[PDB]
Symmetry: C3
Subunit: 32 residues, 3 copies
């Protein structure tokens, strides 16, 4: 069950990184 | 402690899904 | 390995909270 949790956590990590990139773009006016 | 971690992870999953929906809306001009 | 997972989860929690704050700002027109 530990390994399954790590995989969920890793999936959230990638989701969160992609969210951070989009939000920083929206907030700074990146890429227009 | 494993079960408590899963509940935290699940809470983040719902937070992250709601974040993804809002950010996709902001970025595509959904709902005006 | 349990403790290392909790630290990752906690890091995501702080990331997610900061994302929620920025997204709520973008969506309500906070701070201009």
């Amino acid at each position: 069950e530990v390994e399954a949790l790590e995989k969920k956590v890793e999936a959230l990590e990638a989701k969160v990184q992609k969210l951070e990139k989009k939000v920083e773009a929206l907030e700074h006016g990146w890429d227009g």
